[PDB]
Amino acid sequence: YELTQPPSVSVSPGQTARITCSGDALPKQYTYWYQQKPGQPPVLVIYKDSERPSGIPERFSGSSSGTTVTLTISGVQAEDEADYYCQSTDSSAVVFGGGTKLTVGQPKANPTVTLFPPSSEELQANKATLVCLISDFYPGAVTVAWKADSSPVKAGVETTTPSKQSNNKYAASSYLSLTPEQWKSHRSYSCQVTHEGSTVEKTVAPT
Amino acid sequence: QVQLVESGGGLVQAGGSLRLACIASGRTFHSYVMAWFRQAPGKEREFVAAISWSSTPTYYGESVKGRFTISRDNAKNTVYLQMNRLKPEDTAVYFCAADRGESYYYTRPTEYEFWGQGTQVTVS
Amino acid sequence: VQLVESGGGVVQPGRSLRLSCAASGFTFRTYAVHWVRQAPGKGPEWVAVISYDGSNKYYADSVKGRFTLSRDTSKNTLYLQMNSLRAEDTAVYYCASRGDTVAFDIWGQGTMVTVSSASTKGPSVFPLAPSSKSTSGGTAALGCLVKDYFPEPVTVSWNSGALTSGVHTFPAVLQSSGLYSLSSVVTVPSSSLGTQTYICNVNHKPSNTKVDKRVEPKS
Amino acid sequence: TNLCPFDEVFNATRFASVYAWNRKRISNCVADYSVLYNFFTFKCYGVSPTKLNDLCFTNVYADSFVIRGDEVRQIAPGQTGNIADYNYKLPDDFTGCVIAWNSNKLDSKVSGNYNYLYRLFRKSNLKPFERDISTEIYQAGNKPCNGVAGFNCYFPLRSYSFRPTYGVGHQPYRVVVLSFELLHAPATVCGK
C-alpha cells in the first residue's frame, strides 16, 4: 500500500501552499503530516487529518476528502520551506508518502542543456559515457529522459538530484553508460529535460 | 442531581412568624444534611441553620439562635425553618441547601453541593 | 525531550552495526521506544518497537530475523542491533518516543547508516569536447568528465587557477557500481577554441591522483 | 496508652499519587478526634464529628494522596469522574470524613512538579477502595498493543505538572480520607 504526494510544490511568500497526499486506504484511516528541514529530524505538524499540535503555527491546517488529504499553509512564510511527508497506515495487518519539497524569488527559468558524446579515448578504453549537463533552471525540479535514436532507454542512466547554484537557480547532471558498440550502432542519442511542463532536448551522434 | 424548592416566604410584621419549607427530589433525602442560608442585598450568603441525617446535631447562626428552629420530615423529603420573633434584620432571600456530608465547617457555603433558587422573606 | 542518535556510519554488506539512542527529559523507564528509517529518495518506514520493560518487541517483515531491538533503562539508551546489512538498509534512522492524544510523539535528529564497500580508486579523466552553448552569445561549453572514483571529493581547477570565470563544476553522481563521477565545464568564447589552451586540473588526494587533461576542440 | 498516629499522616513531607493512594491502618490507640479536627475542606459522611470522641471503631483507615483543586469534589460518595472512577472510589454508604487543603507551597515547583500522577484510561470503573497501580498499555482499539505506545495504544498514567502560577483549580490539594469501620471484632480505636 502506498501514499502518493507530488515531488515538488512552489509558492510565493504570502500565498497559500497546498500539498496533497492520496491513497486508497485514507477514507477510514487518519493521516499525519511531518515537516523536515535539512539536518533535522521530522516534526509533526498535523495529526488525525486536521488537528494541529499546540506548538505549531496556526497557519498550518489539514483537511480530508475521501482518498486525498491536503496540508494547507496559509500566508506561507520563508521559514515554511521544507520537505513535507504524509503518513498513515494500510487498512489491514505505518506508511509514509514519498515527500514533497515545498519551495517558498525570481522569474521561472528553463534549463540550459548541454549534451556531450563519449570521447575517443574513452571508446579506446572500451567504455562510452554520454553526459547531459543541466543548469540555470528555476524552480529546482526537472525530469530527464534518454533516447537511443527514437526509442526510450532506461538502462545505464544515473541522474543527480538538483542542487542550488550561486545565482539561486539549479543544476543537475545525467549520465548514460553504453558499450562502444551500442554508441556506434545508433544514428544518435538524445537527452530530454522536462521542466515546468516544457521539454528541452539535445542530441549527439557518433563520429 | 437533587432539585430543591423553597416555599412559605413573603411579607410579615416584626414580632411575627413564618415557616419556610424546602422539598427535595429523589428517594435518598435521608442521606442529606439539610441547611438554610440567607442573603441580604450587598452581603454574602450567611449561614442560618443545618440539621444532620438523624435530626440530632442541629446548628444555628449566632443571630437566629433561640428564635429559629430547623426540623426535617424524611417521609415528605422536606426541611422546615420555624422563624419566630422576626426582626427587620431577618429580611433576605432564604436558600435551601443539601449535601451528603456533615461539615465541621457547617457555615461554609462551599461545603453544600445543592442549592435552591431562594425565596424572599420581608419583615416590616 | 531529547533523542541523540549515534553509531551511524559506513558498513560493508554482510557486516553488522549497532545504533544507540540516548533519551533525556522524560522517564525513559516507563515509555515505549521506536525505530524508524528513511532510505534516500524513499518514504518513511517503521522498523521496530519495544515495550517499557524490554519484554515485548515487534519488527517489520523487511527486518525480521535480521535486526534486534533492546534497551538499557539504567543507561537510558535504546539499541538496534543490525546484523547482515544489505544496501536496502542504507537510510537515516530515527528513534522515537511514545506520546499521542486521543502513536508518534517525538523524533530524534537521526543518524545515517551507509551500507557500501567500494574501495579507494582514482578517477579516469576524459574531455567533454567543445559544444555550442549560446549561438547568439558566441560561447561554447567544454569540460572534463571525472569518472569512476572513490571516495569523494575531487578538486577541479582550470588552467592551474588562471581560468576562473565561467567555470561550473557539477555535484557528483553516485553510480550503481559504488563509484562517483562528476563533470566540470567552462563556458568560453567560441572564437578562442583555436587559440587558447584549456586544461582541467583534477586532484583526488585519497588515491594520490593528480592529473591535467587538455581539452582539445576535436572528436 | 498508645496514641493514634495521625501526625504521621497529615504532616508527612511527601504524599502519594492519587492512582497509588496510600493507606495507613490505625488500630488499638487513643485518638483526639475533637482536638485534631478543629482554609480546610472538611466534609463528613454517615457520622458527625462532634460525636467521634464518643464512639469506638474496629479499624480506622487513613487514605492520603494528592489531586488538583477542581477534583476535590470527586472524593465523595456517589461521585463520577476521572479521579472517582479510575483512581480512588468511595462507596455509596461511606462512613467517615474527607479532609483537603491547598498545598501549593509544598507540592508545586517552578519548573513543574511532574512527580504526581493520575490514571486517565481504564477499561472499567474502580470498585470502592480499589487501588490499581498497573501501568499496562491501554488498548483503545481492536489491535493488540503488546506494550507498544501507538495509535489507540496509550500509556494509562499522566502527570499533574504542578506549577505555582496555575489557578486554584489546577493547584495541588493534599487529601486525607478517614474511614470509620465497625464490623464484629473488638472496638479498639476509641476517641478521647
GROMACS .gro file of C-alpha atoms in nm, chain C residues 1-214:
model
  214
  332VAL     CA    1   1.256   1.565   2.514
  333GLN     CA    2   1.599   1.491   2.367
  334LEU     CA    3   1.686   1.194   2.145
  335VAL     CA    4   2.051   1.173   2.040
  336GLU     CA    5   2.134   0.902   1.787
  337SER     CA    6   2.483   0.764   1.731
  338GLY     CA    7   2.664   0.465   1.586
  339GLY     CA    8   2.585   0.558   1.226
  340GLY     CA    9   2.848   0.532   0.956
  341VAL     CA   10   2.990   0.309   0.683
  342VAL     CA   11   2.944  -0.068   0.688
  343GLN     CA   12   3.010  -0.330   0.422
  344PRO     CA   13   2.738  -0.574   0.313
  345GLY     CA   14   2.703  -0.877   0.538
  346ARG     CA   15   2.856  -0.695   0.836
  347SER     CA   16   2.680  -0.572   1.150
  348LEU     CA   17   2.616  -0.237   1.315
  349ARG     CA   18   2.477  -0.118   1.648
  350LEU     CA   19   2.290   0.212   1.677
  351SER     CA   20   2.223   0.389   2.006
  352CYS     CA   21   1.962   0.643   2.115
  353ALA     CA   22   2.019   0.849   2.431
  354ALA     CA   23   1.688   0.974   2.569
  355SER     CA   24   1.656   1.265   2.812
  356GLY     CA   25   1.387   1.484   2.962
  357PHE     CA   26   1.134   1.212   3.049
  358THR     CA   27   1.112   0.888   3.247
  359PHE     CA   28   1.259   0.668   2.973
  360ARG     CA   29   1.187   0.373   3.205
  361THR     CA   30   0.809   0.388   3.153
  362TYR     CA   31   0.768   0.479   2.786
  363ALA     CA   32   0.797   0.260   2.476
  364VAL     CA   33   1.058   0.318   2.208
  365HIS     CA   34   1.054   0.316   1.827
  366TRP     CA   35   1.300   0.291   1.540
  367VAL     CA   36   1.215   0.449   1.202
  368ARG     CA   37   1.427   0.473   0.887
  369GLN     CA   38   1.400   0.650   0.552
  370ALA     CA   39   1.606   0.541   0.252
  371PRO     CA   40   1.736   0.803   0.006
  372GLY     CA   41   1.454   0.923  -0.218
  373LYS     CA   42   1.203   0.692  -0.045
  374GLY     CA   43   0.924   0.730   0.208
  375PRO     CA   44   0.907   0.661   0.579
  376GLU     CA   45   0.933   0.303   0.705
  377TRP     CA   46   0.867   0.183   1.060
  378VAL     CA   47   1.136  -0.058   1.180
  379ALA     CA   48   1.067  -0.182   1.533
  380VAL     CA   49   0.915  -0.101   1.872
  381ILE     CA   50   0.983  -0.208   2.231
  382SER     CA   51   0.773  -0.206   2.547
  383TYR     CA   52   0.852  -0.033   2.877
  384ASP     CA   53   1.046  -0.326   3.024
  385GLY     CA   54   1.205  -0.465   2.707
  386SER     CA   55   0.997  -0.784   2.724
  387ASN     CA   56   0.789  -0.742   2.406
  388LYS     CA   57   0.942  -0.647   2.071
  389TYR     CA   58   0.774  -0.611   1.732
  390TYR     CA   59   0.951  -0.570   1.398
  391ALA     CA   60   0.873  -0.529   1.028
  392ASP     CA   61   0.895  -0.808   0.771
  393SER     CA   62   1.172  -0.615   0.591
  394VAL     CA   63   1.395  -0.651   0.900
  395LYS     CA   64   1.259  -0.960   1.078
  396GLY     CA   65   1.524  -1.206   1.194
  397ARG     CA   66   1.797  -0.965   1.084
  398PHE     CA   67   1.751  -0.676   1.328
  399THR     CA   68   1.719  -0.689   1.706
  400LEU     CA   69   1.593  -0.411   1.934
  401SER     CA   70   1.692  -0.386   2.300
  402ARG     CA   71   1.718  -0.126   2.574
  403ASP     CA   72   1.907  -0.049   2.895
  404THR     CA   73   1.684   0.158   3.123
  405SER     CA   74   1.973   0.215   3.366
  406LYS     CA   75   2.174   0.395   3.096
  407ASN     CA   76   1.856   0.546   2.943
  408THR     CA   77   1.964   0.424   2.599
  409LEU     CA   78   1.789   0.237   2.319
  410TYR     CA   79   1.969  -0.008   2.092
  411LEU     CA   80   1.916  -0.154   1.746
  412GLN     CA   81   2.147  -0.442   1.655
  413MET     CA   82   2.156  -0.456   1.274
  414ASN     CA   83   2.302  -0.786   1.155
  415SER     CA   84   2.374  -0.877   0.792
  416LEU     CA   85   2.307  -0.533   0.649
  417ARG     CA   86   2.210  -0.500   0.283
  418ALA     CA   87   2.213  -0.194   0.058
  419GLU     CA   88   1.838  -0.152   0.117
  420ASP     CA   89   1.921  -0.070   0.481
  421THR     CA   90   2.111   0.247   0.382
  422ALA     CA   91   1.887   0.511   0.539
  423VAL     CA   92   1.856   0.783   0.802
  424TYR     CA   93   1.749   0.605   1.121
  425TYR     CA   94   1.543   0.788   1.383
  426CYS     CA   95   1.449   0.679   1.732
  427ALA     CA   96   1.109   0.785   1.860
  428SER     CA   97   0.933   0.805   2.194
  429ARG     CA   98   0.570   0.741   2.291
  430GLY     CA   99   0.324   1.030   2.317
  431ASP     CA  100  -0.011   1.084   2.144
  432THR     CA  101  -0.358   1.227   2.204
  433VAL     CA  102  -0.694   1.055   2.161
  434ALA     CA  103   0.138   0.684   1.815
  435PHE     CA  104   0.428   0.908   1.714
  436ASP     CA  105   0.537   1.157   1.980
  437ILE     CA  106   0.894   1.286   1.946
  438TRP     CA  107   1.160   1.208   1.685
  439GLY     CA  108   1.536   1.233   1.708
  440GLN     CA  109   1.753   1.419   1.460
  441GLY     CA  110   1.855   1.083   1.313
  442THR     CA  111   2.184   0.915   1.227
  443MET     CA  112   2.274   0.792   0.878
  444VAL     CA  113   2.388   0.437   0.802
  445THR     CA  114   2.561   0.374   0.468
  446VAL     CA  115   2.591   0.012   0.353
  447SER     CA  116   2.867   0.014   0.091
  448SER     CA  117   3.203  -0.149   0.004
  449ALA     CA  118   3.353   0.040  -0.252
  450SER     CA  119   3.732   0.089  -0.231
  451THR     CA  120   3.964   0.384  -0.297
  452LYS     CA  121   4.007   0.441  -0.671
  453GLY     CA  122   4.149   0.733  -0.866
  454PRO     CA  123   3.942   0.889  -1.145
  455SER     CA  124   3.969   0.847  -1.518
  456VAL     CA  125   3.958   1.191  -1.679
  457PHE     CA  126   3.803   1.241  -2.025
  458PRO     CA  127   3.738   1.551  -2.233
  459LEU     CA  128   3.391   1.695  -2.288
  460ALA     CA  129   3.470   1.834  -2.630
  461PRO     CA  130   3.356   2.190  -2.705
  462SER     CA  131   2.990   2.223  -2.794
  463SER     CA  132   2.786   2.528  -2.890
  464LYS     CA  133   2.633   2.676  -2.574
  465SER     CA  134   2.472   3.007  -2.677
  466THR     CA  135   2.488   3.066  -3.051
  467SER     CA  136   2.359   3.421  -3.006
  468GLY     CA  137   2.610   3.471  -2.723
  469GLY     CA  138   2.906   3.338  -2.921
  470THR     CA  139   3.003   3.092  -2.646
  471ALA     CA  140   3.099   2.727  -2.627
  472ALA     CA  141   3.096   2.484  -2.337
  473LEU     CA  142   3.385   2.243  -2.290
  474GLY     CA  143   3.480   2.035  -1.991
  475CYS     CA  144   3.617   1.728  -1.821
  476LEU     CA  145   3.442   1.413  -1.713
  477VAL     CA  146   3.599   1.284  -1.390
  478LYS     CA  147   3.484   0.924  -1.388
  479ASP     CA  148   3.474   0.626  -1.156
  480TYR     CA  149   3.649   0.747  -0.841
  481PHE     CA  150   3.606   0.679  -0.471
  482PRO     CA  151   3.571   0.840  -0.217
  483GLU     CA  152   3.450   1.197  -0.261
  484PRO     CA  153   3.560   1.469  -0.305
  485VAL     CA  154   3.767   1.568  -0.604
  486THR     CA  155   3.902   1.918  -0.659
  487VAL     CA  156   3.894   2.064  -1.014
  488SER     CA  157   4.057   2.381  -1.142
  489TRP     CA  158   4.119   2.513  -1.491
  490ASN     CA  159   4.449   2.629  -1.638
  491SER     CA  160   4.614   2.587  -1.296
  492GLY     CA  161   4.392   2.856  -1.147
  493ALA     CA  162   4.434   3.108  -1.430
  494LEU     CA  163   4.084   3.033  -1.567
  495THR     CA  164   3.812   3.100  -1.310
  496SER     CA  165   3.532   3.288  -1.487
  497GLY     CA  166   3.255   3.078  -1.641
  498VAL     CA  167   3.351   2.759  -1.455
  499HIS     CA  168   3.077   2.527  -1.335
  500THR     CA  169   3.177   2.210  -1.151
  501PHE     CA  170   2.867   1.993  -1.103
  502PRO     CA  171   2.794   1.780  -0.797
  503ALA     CA  172   2.893   1.416  -0.845
  504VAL     CA  173   2.660   1.129  -0.923
  505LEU     CA  174   2.686   0.806  -0.723
  506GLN     CA  175   2.669   0.522  -0.975
  507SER     CA  176   2.531   0.173  -0.909
  508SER     CA  177   2.891   0.050  -0.914
  509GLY     CA  178   2.951   0.245  -0.595
  510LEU     CA  179   3.188   0.486  -0.772
  511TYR     CA  180   3.134   0.857  -0.830
  512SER     CA  181   3.154   1.064  -1.143
  513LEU     CA  182   3.140   1.439  -1.190
  514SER     CA  183   3.180   1.694  -1.466
  515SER     CA  184   3.335   2.038  -1.474
  516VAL     CA  185   3.256   2.273  -1.763
  517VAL     CA  186   3.386   2.614  -1.867
  518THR     CA  187   3.191   2.849  -2.094
  519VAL     CA  188   3.433   3.036  -2.323
  520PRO     CA  189   3.420   3.238  -2.645
  521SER     CA  190   3.383   3.004  -2.942
  522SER     CA  191   3.643   3.213  -3.126
  523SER     CA  192   3.902   3.112  -2.864
  524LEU     CA  193   3.889   2.739  -2.940
  525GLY     CA  194   4.166   2.752  -3.196
  526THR     CA  195   4.397   2.977  -2.995
  527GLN     CA  196   4.360   2.930  -2.617
  528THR     CA  197   4.451   2.601  -2.449
  529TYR     CA  198   4.209   2.465  -2.187
  530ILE     CA  199   4.335   2.216  -1.925
  531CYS     CA  200   4.140   2.084  -1.631
  532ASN     CA  201   4.344   2.006  -1.320
  533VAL     CA  202   4.194   1.717  -1.121
  534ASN     CA  203   4.318   1.626  -0.770
  535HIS     CA  204   4.192   1.319  -0.588
  536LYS     CA  205   4.409   1.308  -0.279
  537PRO     CA  206   4.275   0.979  -0.131
  538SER     CA  207   4.429   0.793  -0.426
  539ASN     CA  208   4.723   1.036  -0.469
  540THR     CA  209   4.596   1.106  -0.819
  541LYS     CA  210   4.667   1.449  -0.966
  542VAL     CA  211   4.619   1.477  -1.340
  543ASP     CA  212   4.578   1.751  -1.600
  544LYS     CA  213   4.367   1.690  -1.911
  545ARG     CA  214   4.393   1.918  -2.215
   0.00000   0.00000   0.00000
